[PDB]
Amino acid sequence: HHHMERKKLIAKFVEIASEKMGKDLETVDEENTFKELGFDSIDVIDLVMFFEDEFALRIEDEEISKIRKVKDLIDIVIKKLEEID
């Protein structure tokens, strides 16, 4: 059992936003849209490429374009990590 997987990926999202992207989010809810967090389409691409590199994943362009909510990115990452297993 890999406990706390969502908490951990939200925490990674917050750290990357802060450290790589200069965005202080502090208290993230998974249900927030990226749009409401102030991430535009280009920011989502940068965020995805940062997760890709951190986790040695590949996320297809079609999947990136469908990302709306934080939850969507957390879900994709878990799914890609589960596969690479």
Automatic annotation (TrEMBL):
O-(pantetheine 4'-phosphoryl)serine modified-residue sites: 41
The keyword 4Fe-4S is assigned to this record: no
Mod. after translation: 4'-phosphopantetheine is transferred from CoA to a specific serine of apo-ACP by AcpS. This modification is essential for activity because fatty acids are bound in thioester linkage to the sulfhydryl of the prosthetic group.
InterPro entries: ACP, ACP-like_sf, PP-bd_ACP, Ppantetheine_attach_site
GO biological process: lipid A biosynthetic process
Reported function: Carrier of the growing fatty acid chain in fatty acid biosynthesis.
Family statement: Belongs to the acyl carrier protein (ACP) family.
Listed name of the protein: Acyl carrier protein
